[PDB]
C-alpha cells in the first residue's frame, strides 16, 4: 500500500488565547491505499488523478458531547490524539472506507521500468533531473559493482517517558544532532526525506502527553563515508509545554547519545537498538569528549 | 418509422385562457383533442376552432403537423382556419376601413398557412379583397 | 379537500423534477427530465391533517421562466430547491429565484430546500466542488439563505435516497396551513 502521513507543524494546538512556539510538530493522520493493482500496472494512465481519502487520528469529540442526559456517570481519558500511529496503522489495515469528508488528495500514477536513468531517459518528460526520487529502504536483487549510495535510515520507533513529577507525560520532542568526535554538530547532516535538503539538527513529533509514545519516524543519514567513521549523534528530549517562554526555557530533561562506529571499527549492526535517556549533569553530557567516554545505550 | 412522442408535455392556450401544461396525446384524432382543449376553457364547438402553435407559425394544427409540438411548444386555441377564414372574408368584402386594415394585414400574414388557406380558398375571400380594393375605393373615395 | 398551489423552482437540473417525482410518484428520476413544467396533485398527512397537494415541477430554465412565471400568479407557496451540489444554485436563488418570485408575488411563503443532501459528507460531491473550488452547501449556509429570503425553513433533501422529501413537502403544506412570524 502507498501510505502518506501528515503532521501539522506550527503550533501545539489550533486554539486561540495563547501563542505557541511556531513550528510545533503535531501529528495529523494518515492515508493508505493498496497498490497491488498499481504495482502490477493495470491502472495505466498519467491523467488519472486518483483521489485518495485521508483519515486523521479520530478527534471524535464534537457532536457526541451535546446530548447525554438523565443518567450522567462517565469519566473517560484522552486517547483521541494520544492514539498510537501503530494503532492507526492497524485500523487502516482493517479500515476499507475512509469518511474523510473532503480531507484528501490527488495523485497521478504510473510504473516505469528500468533504473533511475531510464526513468530519467525514456520518460524524463515525467521525471527530469529535478524530479524527486525515493528509494526502497532495502537492497536490490541485482547489484551493480559500484552501486554508490551511503543511505542510513534511522527510525525513531517508540520510547517510555515516565511522567515523574509532571502529571502530564512529558510532551517529548526528540532533537538529535550529528557531531564529530568533538560534539561539534554538523549542518544538513540529518535529511528529513526525499525532495528536500537535510538539516543540521532534527526535531521529533511532540506526542501530546504520552508516557510510552511510538514514532515510526525515519530519517535519511549520509556523511563522508570516512568522517562518519568518526562521528556520533546526541539527543535532547524536551517537554514542549504549551507556554512559549516555558517551552523554549524548558530544557532537554532527557539526554542521550550514540556512536556511529563500534570501537573495533565495525559500523553499528543494523536492526533495533535501545537507549537510556539521561538526566542530571549536562556538563557531564555536553563535553566534546567526556560524554563520549560515558556510556550511552542499554546494551552497552 | 416510429411516430413522435405521443404524450407531449405542452402548454395549451386560448385568447383569454390561462395556459395549462398538460401531457397531450397525439395519436387521437385531433378533433377530440380540440374538443378537450375547448372544454378546458368551458368551450364547445371544437370543429369551429383550431389549436395552433402559440409559437411563430400560428399554423392551425391539423392531423398533419401535430408531430411538430415539442416539450415546451406552447399550443394556443383560436378560431378554426375555416372560422378565421370566414371572419376575415365578411370583414374583407366589407367597407369599414380600419377593420379591413387589421383583417388585411392579418390575411397577409396568415396567407402562407396552408391549413388556413384551404378554407379561405374554398371560401373565395380573395375575390372579397377584389371587392374591398376595387369597389371599396369608389364606395368611399 | 384542500390542495395548496405550490410552485417548486430552482436552478436547471438541480432536483426540482427529481425531488417532486420522489414526492408525488416516489421514484427518483435517474436521468435529467427537462422540466417545462408539470402540475401534479398528491395526498399526504401533515401533523394529523390529511391534505391534497397541487404541485409544480417548474423549469429551472430561464427560457420557460415566463411559463414558470405563468405558474407565478395564484401561487400560494414557493418551494425553492437549490442544489447543495451546485452552490451556484444557492447564488441564483439569492439573486434570481427568490427575487423573481417575490417580485411577481411578494409575501408568499417560501420554503428553502437543499437538494442532493446525501452528498455533503459523500466524498464524490465534496471532491467535485473542491476541484470546482466550491463547497457543498453546509446546513448553516442554507439557514443563512433561508433567513436571507426570509424562508419558512431550510430543509435538506436527497432525492437519490428519497431523503427529506416527504418532510419537505409536509412543511410546504404547513407553511400555508399555519403561517410563521
Ligand atoms: N444523487 C442525487 N442526484 C440528484 C438528487 N436530486 C436531484 N438530483 C440530480 O438532478 C438531476 C436533474 O434532475 P432535477 O434536479 O430534478 O431537474 P430540475 O431540478 O427539475 O431542473 P429542470 O428540470 O432543468 O428545470 C438528475 O440527473 C439527478 O442526478 C439527489 O437527491 N441525489
Ligand atoms: Mg425543473
SSE blueprint:
This is part of a larger assembly, with chains A (300 residues), B (141 residues) and C (181 residues).
Chain A: E1 2-8, E2 26-33, H1 36-40, E3 49-53, H2 85-94, E4 104-108, H3 116-121, E5 152-158, E6 172-179, E7 190-191, E8 201-203, E9 214-221, E10 232-239, H4 244-249, E11 252-259, H5 290-293
Antiparallel strand pairs in A: 1-2, 3-4, 5-9, 6-8, 6-10, 7-9, 10-11
Chain B: E1 7-14, E2 17-25, H1 30-40, E3 49-53, E4 75-79, H2 81-92, H3 97-110, H4 114-123, H5 126-135
Helix pairs in contact in B: 2-3, 2-4
Chain C: E1 3-9, H1 16-23, E2 37-46, E3 49-58, H2 65-71, E4 77-83, H3 87-104, E5 110-115, H4 123-131, H5 139-148, E6 154-156, H6 165-177
Parallel strand pairs in C: 1-3, 1-4, 4-5, 5-6
Antiparallel strand pairs in C: 2-3
Guanosine-5'-triphosphate is lined by residues 10, 12-19, 29, 32-35, 57, 59-61, 115-116, 118, 158-160 of chain C.
Key traits:
part of a larger assembly, 3 chains, A: 300 residues, alpha+beta, four-stranded antiparallel beta sheet, three-stranded antiparallel beta sheet, 5 helices, flat, C: 181 residues, alpha/beta, six-stranded mixed beta sheet, 6 helices, 36% helix, binds guanosine-5'-triphosphate, binds magnesium ion
Describe the structure.
This is part of a larger assembly, with chains A (300 residues), B (141 residues) and C (181 residues). Chain A has 300 residues and is of the alpha+beta class. Chain A has 5 helices and 11 strands; from the N terminus they run E-E-H-E-H-E-H-E-E-E-E-E-E-H-E-H. Chain A has a 4-stranded antiparallel sheet with strand order 8-6-10-11, with no helix packed on it. Chain B has 5 helices and 4 strands; from the N terminus they run E-E-H-E-E-H-H-H-H. In chain B, a hairpin with a 2-residue loop joins strand 1 (7-14) and strand 2. Chain B is elongated and about 55 Å long. Chain C has 6 helices and 6 strands. A 6-stranded mixed sheet of chain C has the order 2-3-1-4-5-6, sandwiched between helices. Chain C starts with a strand and ends with a helix. Chain B binds chain C through residues 9-11, 18-21, 23, 71-72, 74, and chain C through 34, 36-39, 63-64, 67, 70. The complex binds guanosine-5'-triphosphate and magnesium ion. It is classed as signaling protein. The entry lists the keywords GEF, GTPASE, RAC.
